[PDB]
Amino acid sequence: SEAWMNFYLEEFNLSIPDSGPYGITSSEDGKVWFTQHKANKISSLDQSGRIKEFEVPTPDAKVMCLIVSSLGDIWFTENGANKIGKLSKKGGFTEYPLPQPDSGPYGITEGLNGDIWFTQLNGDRIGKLTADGTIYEYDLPNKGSYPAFITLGSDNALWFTENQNNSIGRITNTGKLEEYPLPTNAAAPVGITSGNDGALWFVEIMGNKIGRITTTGEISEYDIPTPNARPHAITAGKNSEIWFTEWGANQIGRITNDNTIQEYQLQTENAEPHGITFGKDGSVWFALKCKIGKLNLN
Numbered sequence: 001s002e003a004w005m006n007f008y009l010e011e012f013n014l015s016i017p018d019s020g021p022y023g024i025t026s027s028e029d030g031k032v033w034f035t036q037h038k039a040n041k042i043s044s045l046d047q048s049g050r051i052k053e054f055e056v057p058t059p060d061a062k063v064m065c066l067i068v069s070s071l072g073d074i075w076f077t078e079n080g081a082n083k084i085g086k087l088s089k090k091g092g093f094t095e096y097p098l099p100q101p102d103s104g105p106y107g108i109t110e111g112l113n114g115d116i117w118f119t120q121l122n123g124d125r126i127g128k129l130t131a132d133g134t135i136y137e138y139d140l141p142n143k144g145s146y147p148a149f150i151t152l153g154s155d156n157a158l159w160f161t162e163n164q165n166n167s168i169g170r171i172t173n174t175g176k177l178e179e180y181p182l183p184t185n186a187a188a189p190v191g192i193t194s195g196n197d198g199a200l201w202f203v204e205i206m207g208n209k210i211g212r213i214t215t216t217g218e219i220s221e222y223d224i225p226t227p228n229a230r231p232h233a234i235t236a237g238k239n240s241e242i243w244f245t246e247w248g249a250n251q252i253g254r255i256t257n258d259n260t261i262q263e264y265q266l267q268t269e270n271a272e273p274h275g276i277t278f279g280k281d282g283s284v285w286f287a288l289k290c291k292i293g294k295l296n297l298n
Contacts, residue, residue, distance in 0.1 A: 003262045011268065012045060012292040015053065021287035023076070024275035027068040032277065032285050034292065035063040035076055042066065042074055042087055045292060057093050058083060065108045065149065065275075075116050077105035084108070084118060084129055098127070099135055107150035107160060107192075112173065117158045119147035126150070126160065126171050138175050140165070149191050149233070154198035155215040161189035161202055168192070168202065168213050180217045184209060191233035191244065191276075201242050203231035210234070210244060210255065225261055226251060233276045233286075243284050245273035252276075252284065252295055264295060 014021065020038030027033060032045045040061055042054045056063055062080025069075055072089035082103055084096040098105060104122030111117045116129040124140045126147060140147060145165035153159045157172045166187055168180045182189065187207030195201045195212070202211045208229055210222040224231060230248030237243050242255040250271040252264045266273070268288055275287040284295040 003256075004264075006298045007264055008296050008298070009264075009267065010294040010296070011288070012049065012051070012294070014043075014291055015039075015051070017290060019290070021290070021292060022063070022274050023065045024277050024285055024287045024292070025067050026277045026279050026285065027072070028280070029072070030280060032279065032292070033066060033068060033074055034275070034287055035066050037062050037064065037079075042076060042085075054087055054091070054093070056085060058085075058095060061085070064106055067108055067110055069110050069114070069116070071114065075108055075110070077108050077118055079104055079106055079121070084116065084127075096129060096133060096135065098123075099137065100125075103127075107148055109150050109152050109158065111152055111158060112156060115173075117150055117152075119150050119160055121146055121148065121163075126158065126169070128173075136175075138171060138177065140169070140177075141179075148189070149193075149202075151192050151194050151200065153194055153200055153215055157215070159192060159194075159200045159213075161192050163188055163190060163205075168200065168211075168219075170215075170217075178217070180213060180219065182207070182211065183219060184221065187211075191231070193234045193236055193242075195240070195242060196236050196238075197240055201234055201236070203234050203244055205230050205232065205247075210242065210253070210261070222255065222261060224253065224263075226263055229253070229263075232274050235276050235278050237278050237284070238282060243276055243278060245276045245286055247272050247274060252286065266293065268293065 019036040061078035066076035074087040103120040106121040107119040146163035150160035187204035229246035
């Protein structure tokens with residue numbers, strides 16, 4: 001029984017045909033949440049297929065990454081408007097303007113004690129937004145680093161990709177920063193996630209590899225079978241498994257328990273998958289160019 005026989009795809013069409021679905025994440029209540037950067041919405045998709053749209057208060061906000069916090073709030077970056085957004089578990093918005101202009105907030109994740117961490121792609125700095133709404137910032141030593149995705153590592157430090165510095169950054173709550181150069185030149189890391197193995201897993205969009213970096217900084221790589229796949233986002237699945245989107249190949253990738261990569265070919269024309277998440281029931285969800293996609297295994 002080969003893997004290609006053992007999957008099936010579903011799609012969920014959206015209210016308007018060109019809303020820019022980008023980021024996607026999963027909630028513990030079973031809902032999938034996503035950003036729509038052209039429509040300027042945050043939307044949920046529930047277990048019965050019902051969609052609820054929320055209008056981002058700031059126009060032309062270019063909403064990018066999002067997460068569901070441990071309190072059930074939806075936090076997101078307003079890349080175009082220089083703000084962090086919050087949609088409360090109750091359903092009201094709060095927005096937090098950044099202290100320096102044109103920062104380009106991008107990646108977002110929850111840290112400890114309710115702290116919300118984010119990258120500033122054009123700012124070349126990392127931010128922390130605390131319970132009382134104070135923002136603290138930390139400069140990267142190189143300008144044009146382009147810090148992209150960010151995630152909470154198994155060591156409780158914040159790990160992020162530096163797309164153009166070709167490195168993985170690690171920052172602690174004390175502000176102590178370390179950077180780990182990638183072994184592949186101009187690899188251009190984008191997505192990062194924490195694996196169930198306790199390591200950080202990332203994509204190299206130009207390197208055409210999946211990277212793994214331990215919390216002590218040891219890097220290993222996996223060659224993506226399809227050339228020019230342009231991998232974008234990445235998430236842990238069940239056990240040691242890892243799932244990722246191939247924006248350039250219209251494919252979903254998977255590293256299985258036997259440590260080999262399986263690729264799944266999507267049917268949607270111009271699928272161009274970006275964000276990816278793993279549902280509580282083992283569904284693999286992803287943001288396509290114009291709609292939401294779902295992959296299930298048998």
